[PDB]
Ligand binder design. Structure first.
Ligand SMILES: Nc1ncnc2c1ncn2[C@@H]1O[C@H](CSCC[C@H](N)C(=O)O)[C@@H](O)[C@H]1O
Lengths: 7, 159
């Protein structure tokens, strides 16, 4: 299960 | 004057973006995180640290790529999403390179903050020192993913 990066 | 200073500040940053110069940093191994980036020099509050450099893509390509990445556990999670002029973009740093922004680990209480920096309508994600940074520190910034699905899989997002 992946996470992301978000501004 | 605010004017001249804003100009000087833009020229420093743009110079650094363009050179891809990444001085003052080195890769180390960090217990429980894998690789991370250590400062080898002092940075002052507000200084350009490094660009989050990778492939700048729009939303359709980003979705295509995520679907592909998810089918491989060893890929890792390097996509950095943002909004710019009412559209979603992504800097996808999944590809191994020698660039350092992509190796910086997460903390909600880190020492870098990511900024959107426009160069003629082309957005760049830059990491700026949010405070003075001592040589020997791990560079860290808030990845920003607070979603239940992510913080359950990856509990270190909570910190
Ligand atoms: N605070 C933290 N605690 C644990 N793992 C972390 C972390 N911040 C980042 N990571 C790890 O780093 C990944 C993002 S890519 C950052 C570089 C990575 N550490 C590497 O060696 O390639 C995360 O998915 C997680 O595996």
């Amino acid at each position: 299960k992946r996470h992301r990066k978000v501004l | 004057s605010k004017a001249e200073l804003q100009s000087e500040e833009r020229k420093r940053i743009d110079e650094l973006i363009e050179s891809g110069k990444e001085e003052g940093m080195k890769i180390d191994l960090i217990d429980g995180k894998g690789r991370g980036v250590i400062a080898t020099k002092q940075f002052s509050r507000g200084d350009f640290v490094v660009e989050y450099h990778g492939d700048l893509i729009e939303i359709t390509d980003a979705k295509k790529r995520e679907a592909l990445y998810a089918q491989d556990p060893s890929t890792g999670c390097y996509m950095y999403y943002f909004q710019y002029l009412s559209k979603t973009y992504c800097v996808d740093a999944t590809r191994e390179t020698n660039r350092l922004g992509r190796l910086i680990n997460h903390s909600k209480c880190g020492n870098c903050q990511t900024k959107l920096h426009d160069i003629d309508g082309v957005p760049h994600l830059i990491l700026i020192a949010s405070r003075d940074i001592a040589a020997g520190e791990e560079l860290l910034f808030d990845y920003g993913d607070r979603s239940k699905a992510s913080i359950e899989a990856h509990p270190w997002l909570k910190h």
